[PDB]
Design brief:
Chain lengths: 348, 293, 87, 42
């Protein structure tokens, strides 16, 4: 306060007039003579103390580094908000990796870059696919060559595992994976996922009639549930949990099926998180509502009503997804008539 | 020059021997990780000073991949450091040791990323970070908070070095067999005998007739020994009881309903065994010392 | 065996046969009995009086795995399980 | 000074590491002696 110090001790520490900057730096610990000359001292030690100021120095250099290769960065809010609060003095560095990893799906490279190492993907302005570049953020004053040479060796080590898993996972078509999903349990009283899928494919016909969808589209629906939610037993989804739902669509598209069933396979999980998109194709709505109703009825059959705090299975999220799908799509429904039909095929 | 594997140990031991830690030998029974050693789980409980650094192999049959995947092995060597009480230089001594190992700090991005460790098998948790060095996760740092069921007093600091990847990232190799143990010999030509045969045994030749009848026998023997106020052998049997469950999981003959039963039995045995060491040591008067304030 | 002022501290042996095969070439084995070297060098008379490090001793941290083990090996080792684990 | 137990190992290892020997870890299973280790018998 001003020139004199406020004497008070907290947690066995006496307040004084010393503050430490960057570790191993020249200003290991400095003495502030007056409280007026404080914010000027920290920026003399290189620390960008302001929370919002670091964003305008991260995103002002990440874009500048992009034009060297003629591209742009991808900046999700949930990624930059966490990258900002991990660095005391940001410094962006670009790096390269081999092009042979472009054969992988577009949504695998992005997931690996953004969920484990927290890098920045680079997309070209023209032909807007991925590019063999990435942007990372160092911390402090570090040698430029060493960080890149030691960081690309990790980025090209993750992709070897990813490509091996993908190659081993595309040896057989998606049909065979529907049998070996029994290793994933749904509920101790209900069973695994195979029984859930059989119940869904059995009860989809009635729900497709309650919503009033035309009979001419009833065959394709009966086939979609034949391969519905089969990606959960694949290899690329065993460790990449966030990819569940879309890899099924990719496998179905590669297998050589119609485009009216891949969308239904993909849109069986929407919405996945708050703010995500909603189903927009008619055959996918039936599968989504059938899955929600079956998951609600089965879990309420064992009496597992969540309280206000604990979420054993997040039944509130499922109900909120169901009502959002029903309302934001303008479809007539009868809840008390569909619930009885859904509960009919329950084992107990 | 380039650092070798057999002298990184010599640099990580003579350093912690100067701070004040007492270096000891490795475990005896096959430990499924680096924490279940009796030199760390049973000794953090109770108010006595304890500063120990040692090196131990860790065997995990569930991560067996025939010794081909350059990241996952069935036997990896770890370095463990336990400090109690924390002297206040907890994360400065670590950086000094890292500098003394042979790598520089001024030219490498050494950062801490938060990560909360928790293990329901033995009932422990805490708060800590993992150390990123140019994107590689090489070290776990953790302030403990609870072991078994007792609350820690005073809390302890655990530093775990994953020593197999530090040199794999420092030398510049791409595979794991390319690690050099010493000047003249390599790691991938003498530590694959205990890799290939062990992977084959853990994958498709582990006779499951004997494991499911050794598990309950070990559990009952541990309970009987614990009922006689014999703590050390009672806990020793728990390690070889918990190894059988992992080897059963490796083969794939454990269903999704018996998992809860096995975890409950093991955690109950560990809980009732842990609270006996504290009662055993208090009658001796705490010869090592006592902590106050 | 190497005698140092009457103490037997080391075994030195040229091998000749292992299992049933004859050794080729023969090997040299040197075995240090390390618990008595310091017991004779420092000047102590008991074994617990050995000092492990500057500040701590050997007889205050390596008797837990001694007294409990001796009791187990003497009169509490349940022989029902050993004779069926051996075979 | 007087030799201590935890540095006799440090003097008996750094010596044999200069002749050319390769120092390794101890056994795993309870060995009844110092010869039955798989690093010497086999």
């Amino acid at each position: 306060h001003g020139d004199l110090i406020v004497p008070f001790c907290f947690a066995g520490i006496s307040s004084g007039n010393q503050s430490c900057g960057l570790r191993n730096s020249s200003l290991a610990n400095f003495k502030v003579e007056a409280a007026e000359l404080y914010l000027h001292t920290l920026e003399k030690a290189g620390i960008l103390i302001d929370m919002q100021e670091r964003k305008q120095r991260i995103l002002h250099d990440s874009s500048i580094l992009a034009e060297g290769v003629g591209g742009d960065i991808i900046a999700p809010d949930s990624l930059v908000q966490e990258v900002i609060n991990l660095v005391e003095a940001p410094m962006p560095i670009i790096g390269r990796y081999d092009v042979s990893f472009l054969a992988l799906p577009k949504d695998v490279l992005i997931t690996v870059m953004q969920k484990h190492q927290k890098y920045f993907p680079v997309t070209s302005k023209t032909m807007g696919n991925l590019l063999p570049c990435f942007i990372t953020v160092a911390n402090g004053a570090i040698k430029e060559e060493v960080v890149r040479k030691g960081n690309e060796a990790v980025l090209r080590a993750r992709y070897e595992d990813a490509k091996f898993f993908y190659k081993m996972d595309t040896q057989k078509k998606l049909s065979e994976f529907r049998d070996q999903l029994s290793s994933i349990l749904f509920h101790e009283r209900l069973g695994t996922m195979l029984d859930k899928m059989k119940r869904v494919e059995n009860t989809v016909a009635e729900v497709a009639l309650l919503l009033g969808i035309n009979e001419k589209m009833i065959p394709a629906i009966k086939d979609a549930a034949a391969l519905a939610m089969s990606d959960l037993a694949t290899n690329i989804v065993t460790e990449f949990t966030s990819l569940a739902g879309i890899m099924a669509r990719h496998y179905a598209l590669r297998d050589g099926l119609s485009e009216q069933i891949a969308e239904a396979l993909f849109e069986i999980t929407l919405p996945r998180f708050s703010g995500d998109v909603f189903p927009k194709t008619d055959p996918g709505i039936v599968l989504a509502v059938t899955d929600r109703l079956d998951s609600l009825v089965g879990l309420f059959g064992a009496g597992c009503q969540p309280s206000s705090t604990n979420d054993p299975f997040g039944l509130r999220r499922i109900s909120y997804g169901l009502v959002q799908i029903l309302v934001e799509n303008k479809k007539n429904f009868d809840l008390t008539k569909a619930l009885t039909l859904v509960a009919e095929e329950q084992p107990i | 020059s380039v650092l070798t594997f057999q002298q990184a140990i010599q640099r990580l031991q003579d350093y912690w021997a100067s701070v004040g830690c007492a270096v000891m030998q490795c475990s005896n029974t096959e430990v499924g990780a680096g924490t279940m050693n009796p030199l760390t789980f049973l000794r953090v409980l109770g108010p006595e000073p304890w500063n120990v650094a040692y090196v131990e192999p860790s065997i995990r049959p569930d991560d067996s991949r025939y010794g081909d995947n350059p990241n996952r092995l069935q036997r990896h060597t770890q370095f463990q450091v336990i400090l109690k009480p924390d002297p206040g230089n907890s994360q400065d001594l670590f950086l000094h040791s890292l500098s003394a190992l042979g790598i520089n700090v001024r030219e490498h991005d050494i950062r801490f990323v938060e990560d909360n460790w928790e293990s329901p098998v033995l009932g422990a948790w805490g708060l800590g970070w993992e150390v990123w060095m140019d994107g590689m996760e090489i070290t776990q740092f953790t302030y403990f908070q609870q072991s078994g069921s007792l609350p820690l007093l005073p809390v302890s600091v655990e530093i775990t070095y994953g020593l197999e990847r530090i040199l794999m990232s420092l030398q510049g190799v791409d595979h794991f067999k390319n690690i050099q143990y010493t000047k003249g010999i390599t790691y991938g030509e003498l530590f694959l005998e205990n890799e290939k045969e062990m992977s084959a045994y853990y994958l498709e030749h582990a006779n499951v007739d004997n494991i499911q009848k050794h598990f309950d026998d070990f559990e009952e023997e541990a309970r009987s020994l614990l009922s006689l106020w014999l703590p050390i052998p009672a806990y020793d049997h728990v390690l070889k009881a918990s190894h059988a469950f992992n080897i059963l999981d490796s083969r794939g003959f454990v269903g999704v309903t018996e998992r809860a039963r096995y975890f409950g039995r093991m955690r109950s045995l560990a809980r009732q065994c842990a609270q006996l060491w504290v009662k055993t040591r208090e009658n001796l008067g705490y010869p090592l010392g006592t902590y106050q304030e």
